[PDB]
Amino acid sequence: RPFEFRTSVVVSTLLGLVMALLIHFVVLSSGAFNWLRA
Amino acid sequence: RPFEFRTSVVVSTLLGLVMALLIHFVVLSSGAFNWLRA
Amino acid sequence: RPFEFRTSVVVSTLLGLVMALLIHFVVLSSGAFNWLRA
Amino acid sequence: RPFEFRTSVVVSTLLGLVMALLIHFVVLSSGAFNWLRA
Amino acid sequence: RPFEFRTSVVVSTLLGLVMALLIHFVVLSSGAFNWLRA
Amino acid sequence: EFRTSVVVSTLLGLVMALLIHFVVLSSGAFNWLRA
Amino acid sequence: RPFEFRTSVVVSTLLGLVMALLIHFVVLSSGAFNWLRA
Amino acid sequence: RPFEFRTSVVVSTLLGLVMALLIHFVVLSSGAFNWLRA
Amino acid sequence: RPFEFRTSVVVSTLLGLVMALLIHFVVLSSGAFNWLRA
Amino acid sequence: MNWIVATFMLMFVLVAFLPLVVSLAYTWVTNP
Amino acid sequence: NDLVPDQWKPLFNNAQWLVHDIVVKTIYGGLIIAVIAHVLCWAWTPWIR
Amino acid sequence: NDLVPDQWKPLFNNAQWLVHDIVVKTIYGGLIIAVIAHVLCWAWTPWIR
Amino acid sequence: NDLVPDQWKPLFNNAQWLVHDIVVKTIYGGLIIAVIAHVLCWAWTPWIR
Amino acid sequence: NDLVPDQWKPLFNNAQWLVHDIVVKTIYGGLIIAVIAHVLCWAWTPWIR
Amino acid sequence: NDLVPDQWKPLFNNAQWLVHDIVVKTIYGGLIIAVIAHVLCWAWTPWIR
Amino acid sequence: NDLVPDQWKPLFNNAQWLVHDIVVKTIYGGLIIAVIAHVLCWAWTPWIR
Amino acid sequence: PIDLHDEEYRDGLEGTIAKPPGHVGWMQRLLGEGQVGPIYVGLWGVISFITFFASAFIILVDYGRQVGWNPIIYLREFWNLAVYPPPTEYGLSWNVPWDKGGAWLAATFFLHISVLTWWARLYTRAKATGVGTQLAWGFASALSLYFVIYLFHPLALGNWSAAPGHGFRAILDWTNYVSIHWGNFYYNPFHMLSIFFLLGSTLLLAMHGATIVATSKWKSEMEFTEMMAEGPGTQRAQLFWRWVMGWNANSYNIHIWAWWFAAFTAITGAIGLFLSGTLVPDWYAWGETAKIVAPWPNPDWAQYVF
Amino acid sequence: PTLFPEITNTVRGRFYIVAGIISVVMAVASIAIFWWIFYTITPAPAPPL
Amino acid sequence: SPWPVWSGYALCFVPLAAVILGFIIAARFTDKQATSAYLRLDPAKAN
Amino acid sequence: RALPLPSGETLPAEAASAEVIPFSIIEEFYKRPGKTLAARFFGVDPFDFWIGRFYVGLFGAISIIGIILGVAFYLYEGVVNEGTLNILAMRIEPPPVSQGLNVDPAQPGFFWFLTMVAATIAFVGWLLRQIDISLKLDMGMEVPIAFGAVVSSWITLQWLRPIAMGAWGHGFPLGITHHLDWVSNIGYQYYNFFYNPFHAIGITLLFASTLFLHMHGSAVLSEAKRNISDQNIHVFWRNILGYSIGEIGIHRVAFWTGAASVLFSNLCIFLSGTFVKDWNAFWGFWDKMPIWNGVGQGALVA
Amino acid sequence: MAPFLMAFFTIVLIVATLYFLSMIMS
Ligand code: BCL
Ligand code: BCL
Ligand code: BCL
Ligand code: BCL
Ligand code: BCL
Ligand code: BCL
Ligand code: BCL
Ligand SMILES: CC(C)=CCC/C(C)=C/C=C/C(C)=C/C=C/C(C)=C/C=C/C=C(C)/C=C/C=C(C)/C=C/C1=C(C)C(=O)CCC1(C)C
Ligand SMILES: CC(C)=CCC/C(C)=C/C=C/C(C)=C/C=C/C(C)=C/C=C/C=C(C)/C=C/C=C(C)/C=C/C1=C(C)C(=O)CCC1(C)C
Ligand SMILES: CC(C)=CCC/C(C)=C/C=C/C(C)=C/C=C/C(C)=C/C=C/C=C(C)/C=C/C=C(C)/C=C/C1=C(C)C(=O)CCC1(C)C
Ligand SMILES: [Fe+3]
């Protein structure tokens, strides 16, 4: 057992949430889409 | 007993005093009433 | 029992008070209502 | 005793003194009265 | 026996001294009496 | 302690003497050291 | 005894040296004497 | 014994050297004597 | 024995070297001699 | 008021120093 | 806890019940005074407008 | 606690009852003085205007 | 506790009663002096104007 | 504390009494010198004017 | 502390008394030299004027 | 401490006395040289003027 | 397998010197230990010492050259004397005159060797005396900041002048100039992180020292023993911090906190300093686009004018 | 008639009252007399041209 | 236009989030370890 | 049995008086009510209970009043009165220097004064509550001494210096990212606060505090879970640097350096306001100390 | 009238001090 499954779950879920937030914020600040008032 | 009665009394009394002070100060600083030269 | 009832009560009450204060402050600062001399 | 008479006396007396000082200072700083050259 | 006379004496004397100092300093700083400069 | 009072009083007196000498000399009021 | 003789000697000697240096420097810098081309 | 002889020797010798250096410097910087093109 | 001979030797030798360097540098910087284009 | 009040506040800053000095002297006196 | 109603016996001591009664009556009096104060301040200067 | 009324015997000691009586009478006197002071300060300079 | 009136015997020791008498008389003297000082300071410079 | 008067025996050691005597005499001499210095500085330049 | 007078025996060791004698004589010599230096500097340039 | 005079036996070791003698003679020689240097520097350029 | 006496009292290289240990006396009374003890000289201490000596000697004799070889002007200006890096012209070049940054390059190279071999000394003596190498890695974080300041930020900016000038006043001047050149370092967010970690470093140091000196009567300071079984002093410390702020650490966790707060100070500082020149030329201007700058339409400027 | 016999009866404690009083008045006199001297001898800052 | 720049966000806010979150989690685990049961000297005896 | 240790290591019990004790046992053994400062003064601590893990004293209740009121006043001045909605752009400003030392509810800057007073009440109550809890546990007064150093740093910045300057607008604004604007404008008004000597001492002690923290965390972590004779870290610290301060010495130095940093710091900002206007002009005396005045030519003279 | 009043209050301070210190020093 190289990795506890709970550890991989925590790390993957936190990475996914952080990346979703980061990508949403980058896309919204880019003004490239016209989403939420251009 | 989930909550000692003394604890609830202390918390409620302190919350009420803090809220009375806060609301008095907000209302007095608003200058909306003409109280104490407002 | 996953949650002590006292813990849930404290958390819910504090969250509700904080949210009431936050929403009141946001609504009063918005100047959207004409409350307390707008 | 959860409610000692000495405890209630100390708390009430200190609260009254603090409130008297606070109200005096708020009223004196308001400049609304012309007390002590205002 | 509650409220030792010694305790009440200490508390009252200290409160009176603190209040005399506070009132003297408030009155002197107010310049209504002008730190006695007149 | 008597030693504590002695130290405090002596240091206060020395500091006071130095301070007053320096205030009086810098005032240029008395004709001391070409003032 | 209240004071070790060595302590009093150190303190007095250091005070005397510091005061001699201070007075010499004050008198020199005053230019009131014409010493060392003044 | 109030004072080790070695301590008094160290202190006196260091004080004398420091004072000789200080006085030489002060006299040389004063330009009051033609020492070293002054 | 008040003073180890090794200590006196170290102190005297270091003092002599420091003083020789200091005096050489003071004399060379004075430009009073015409040594090393001074 | 400028220099009197200023020096009183200066002395309060040094008073703030004081507790730490008491701690150092405590260590010295109690480690004999 | 004899003076306490058996509904609230698991929660209230005998002495805590009397202090609770004082607190309840004080809160009620303060509420009446607060309602009167709010009606007076509204008749004086309406804050909602 | 004999001097204490039975209603307040669970709460008040014998000595605490006398000190409570002093505190109550002091609070009442201070309240009368405070009402007089407020009426005088209002007759002098109304703060609510 | 013999010197104490029986009303205040639950509260005051024999020695505490004498010190309490001194404190009361000192407070009264200080009050008279404070009233005199306030009347003098008012006749000199009224702070309420 | 043999050389100390019995009035000051609770306060002064035997050695502390002699050092206190020196301190007192030094303070008195310094006070005389300070009075003389103040009279001379006043005769020279009055600072009150 | 035999060499010490019995008045100062509580304060001075046997060796501290000799060093104190040296310090006293040095202070006296320095005082005489300081008085001479002050008289000479006054005859040269009076600082008080 | 045999070589030390009995006056200074409480203060000086046997070896410290010889080093003290060297220090004293060095201080005296340096003092003579310093006096000569001061007289020469005064004859050259008086600093007091 | 580790002789504690042999590691203290071996002779020569890979041995110690000053081996008859002195006692300071006042250090024993105030700090509890007064033995200066023998100090190790282990072929990394030698490189460290002689390369630092080369660095300091270059700097000191260039101080001497700058005062015209006057040892009084030396003592007077010693704190404002400095050996500055080569100017912006010919910025990364090492073909700079000795007075215009030539001395700075050599001294800084020898200083680099000195700090690297001091790291190696920390590492090798930690392994030799049986302790972990945590101090060597803490020094490595400090050295990350150091090598950004002196080597990696001057490079990637194109000039040695981006580096400090080897002086008592020059490092203060360098800090001022670097914050001024890149806008305002107050709006450098990794500078804010590094200040968070530095002030939290001092806060944890003060709290830890004060807690252990307060519970000192029950021998809380003997952390090695307390980590095996927590005595009454450590128990009182845990309870103090539980009652004060609702959570606590044991004898072991608190030092993890200490190590990591200091390491984060150094690491976030290195990152922010490297970012200021290369990626974000202006921190206040970036802060306005980042919406972290407070609007200040009508400031009261009477406070800031005499 | 006292409640602090270790402070008002014993010579060491009784002395502490006088010590505290004298130290408070000594510090106050220190500060007050310094500022008096400073403000009386110091000239007014020269009137602006 | 109301939006800070990507740079601003990355730099300030996800390090802000990391510091706050990570501090809270580190405190959680600090105290789990500190309040767990391990070899202590019994207070009734040693004290 | 596994025998779990404080570090987290499980050591198998043979390879001391210690037993595996629950914290709940440690916590209940050390409760000891009624030793607090308030219980000495009034004869009782009005709040001698624990709310959860926290100890609520008289000064804990005062402190929590201060905390709640300070947070609410802070957020009133900056959500309302400023309208910002984002805490990095809000600006909690004192009254203007024009107003002087007096406070006016009608004038702007009134909620800064209230936030500052409530924050002072909160900080002083936190300090007095630390004294409470150290008195309960028979500890020394060192944690209150260090926290008092930093609380006096706050008092100097918001009370002593604004009073001595006399304007009450010399207190720093309570804004995230905007108190930095005050720190920068004060640092440059008295130009080169780097040359402020009490500021240089404060920075020296801050850097030394972080260095000592790293060295101590390193030293304790390096000997943590090893077979060590407790003298290995001393030998290491004598092989490196030729001095080992010892276990009690490193914590004393920790406490002292920590406190002294902010003590010299508050001496710096106070002097910067009141006595020294220019910190470069302060150092004008150095080149004129008469021991090196005369020796120089060209640019090498001063 | 300010010098009058300051002198008055200092002498009341002093006389108060003589009175109660006389009691304490009894
Ligand atoms: C984020 C990580 C999640 C997780 C998410 C998944 C997902 C999702 C799956 C598994 C599945 C598996 N996981 Mg899992 N898994 C987690 C934690 C664990 C842990 C752990 C240490 O405890 C273990 C041991 C496992 C083990 C396993 C096996 C039970 C199983 C088969 C994997 C395999 O054979 O790979 C062999 C196959 C590959 C390695 C293919 C590699 C694919 C690469 C990336 C190419 C993808 C092409 C892409 C789809 C096309 C892109 C086109 C775009 C649309 C344009 N998981 C963590 C929590 N796991 C698989 C499963 O169970 O099947 C039902 C699967 O679907
Ligand atoms: C608008 C188009 C923008 C863009 C904007 C975004 C945004 C916005 C996002 C991504 C995200 C992603 N994009 Mg993109 N993306 C673009 C261009 C690209 C390109 C390409 C070269 O052009 C690529 C390869 C990608 C690749 C990706 C993957 C990294 C990811 C989507 C799959 C993934 O792994 O997460 C798959 C996600 C999941 C498996 C999470 C599932 C979570 C579940 C469904 C819960 C959702 C939250 C739910 C509301 C909570 C409810 C709980 C209640 C209690 C019930 N993007 C363009 C520029 N991209 C998404 C991402 O997640 O980043 C990690 C995202 O946030
Ligand atoms: C004026 C209209 C403003 C607005 C201003 C406010 C304000 C102002 C508030 C809310 C609050 C809320 N609003 Mg809104 N709200 C608006 C638009 C919306 C919209 C919508 C999409 O338009 C929605 C969905 C909401 C949703 C909500 C809920 C989050 C909440 C009310 C129910 C709740 O859960 O708490 C229900 C509340 C309770 C269950 C608490 C009960 C407490 C008891 C009654 C005690 C009250 C205190 C009492 C005085 C103490 C006496 C004690 C004495 C000792 C006796 N608002 C508009 C913009 N909104 C309220 C809230 O509480 O936020 C949490 C509130 O404070
Ligand atoms: C001038 C008019 C000002 C104003 C200035 C003040 C001032 C000034 C004060 C108050 C105080 C109070 N005011 Mg207001 N007040 C105003 C407007 C209002 C309004 C209103 C909506 O308009 C209201 C409801 C109040 C309400 C109140 C109460 C909170 C309180 C008076 C009763 C009380 O509980 O304490 C009753 C007080 C007592 C029971 C204490 C009794 C103490 C005894 C008598 C000892 C007194 C000290 C004595 C000298 C010590 C001697 C000891 C020697 C040893 C013998 N004020 C206007 C703006 N108000 C008073 C207060 O105490 O605040 C708590 C006070 O200090
Ligand atoms: C020129 C006139 C200047 C002035 C310049 C100085 C100078 C310059 C000095 C004083 C010093 C003093 N002056 Mg003045 N002084 C003036 C006006 C005054 C007035 C007055 C109101 O007018 C007064 C009261 C004083 C008062 C004093 C005393 C504080 C002191 C001299 C006695 C003393 O205690 O130390 C007596 C000194 C001793 C007991 C020390 C004895 C030391 C022994 C002799 C060793 C000397 C060093 C020796 C070379 C080392 C050799 C060691 C080798 C190894 C052998 N001055 C005027 C303005 N004054 C002197 C002083 O010492 O300050 C403390 C001094 O330095
Ligand atoms: C040129 C005239 C300048 C002046 C320049 C100097 C200079 C320059 C010096 C003094 C020093 C002194 N001056 Mg002056 N001095 C002046 C005006 C004064 C006046 C006066 C009111 O006018 C006074 C009272 C003094 C008083 C003094 C004494 C403080 C001292 C000389 C005696 C002493 O104690 O040290 C006596 C010195 C000794 C006992 C040391 C003996 C050391 C032995 C001889 C070794 C010497 C070093 C030797 C080379 C090392 C060889 C080692 C090899 C291994 C063999 N000066 C005028 C302004 N003055 C001298 C001093 O030493 O200061 C402490 C000195 O340096
Ligand atoms: C050019 C004239 C300059 C001047 C420039 C210098 C210079 C330059 C120096 C001195 C030094 C000295 N001068 Mg001068 N000096 C001047 C004016 C004066 C006056 C005077 C009032 O006018 C005086 C009293 C002095 C007094 C002195 C003594 C302090 C000293 C010489 C004797 C001494 O003690 O060290 C005697 C020295 C020794 C005993 C050291 C012996 C060392 C042995 C010989 C080794 C030498 C190094 C050797 C090369 C190493 C070889 C090792 C290999 C392995 C074999 N100078 C004028 C202004 N002076 C010299 C000194 O040493 O300062 C301490 C020196 O460096
Ligand atoms: C513009 C923007 C930003 C808008 C944001 C939009 C969002 C995100 C809104 C989010 C809203 C949310 C999440 C609101 C939350 C509301 C809650 C949790 C209310 C809690 C009420 C809790 C209550 C009533 C608790 C009551 C507690 C009581 C009565 C205590 C009871 C008691 C206890 C427990 C005792 O022992 C004894 C005393 C007593 C009996 C009184
Ligand atoms: C514009 C603005 C800022 C408006 C603010 C609006 C708000 C929020 C107002 C808030 C008002 C409130 C909350 C006021 C609080 C009033 C109280 C609690 C008074 C206490 C009285 C307690 C009193 C008099 C206690 C008296 C105690 C006494 C006489 C004690 C006596 C004694 C006791 C018992 C002893 O040992 C033995 C005997 C002795 C005499 C010494
Ligand atoms: C602005 C201006 C002008 C200000 C100025 C105004 C003032 C305040 C002037 C101050 C004057 C003062 C304070 C002068 C002080 C002069 C002194 C202390 C000289 C010391 C001599 C010490 C001497 C000679 C020590 C010699 C030591 C020796 C010979 C050592 C000898 C030796 C030691 C000890 C050994 O191991 C073994 C034997 C060996 C011989 C080698
Ligand atoms: Fe530690």
From TrEMBL, chains A, B, C, D, E, G, H, I:
Localisation per UniProt entry: Cell membrane
Secretion signal span: none
Entry annotated with the keyword Membrane: yes
Location (main, coarse): membrane
GO molecular function, one term: bacteriochlorophyll binding
Gene Ontology terms describing biological process: photosynthesis, light reaction
Residues bound to bacteriochlorophyll a 4: H24, W35
Stated name of the protein: Alpha subunit of light-harvesting 1
UniProtKB/TrEMBL annotation, chains K, L, M, N, O, P:
The Antenna complex alpha/beta subunit domain, residue ranges: 17-48
Its biological purpose: Antenna complexes are light-harvesting systems, which transfer the excitation energy to the reaction centers.
Molecular function (Gene Ontology), one example: bacteriochlorophyll binding
Protein name: Beta subunit of light-harvesting 1
Organism of this sequence: Roseiflexus castenholzii
Keyword field contains Kinase: no
NCBIfam families, A to Z: pufB_517_ASD
Family: Belongs to the antenna complex beta subunit family.
Residues annotated as binding bacteriochlorophyll a 1: W8, H20
From TrEMBL, chain Q:
Residues binding bacteriochlorophyll a 8: Y186, H191
Residues that bind bacteriochlorophyll a 6: F185, Y186, H191
Stretches that traverse the bilayer: 39-61, 102-123, 135-153, 192-214, 256-275
Amino-acid positions noted as binding Mn(2+) in the UniProt annotation, renumbered to this chain: H208, E223, H255
Binding-site residues, Fe(3+): H208, E223, H255
Residues given in the record as bacteriochlorophyll a 7 binding sites: Y186, H191
Compartments in which it is found: Endomembrane system
Similarity comment: family membership: Belongs to the reaction center PufL/M/PsbA/D family.
Role played: The reaction center is a membrane-bound complex that mediates the initial photochemical event in the electron transfer process of photosynthesis.
Protein name per UniProt: Reaction center protein L chain
Lineage: Bacteria, Bacillati, Chloroflexota, Chloroflexia, Chloroflexales
From TrEMBL, chain R:
Transmembrane segments: 15-38
Coiled-coil annotated spans: none
Name this polypeptide is given: Uncharacterized protein
Residues of the full protein shown: 6 to 54 of 320
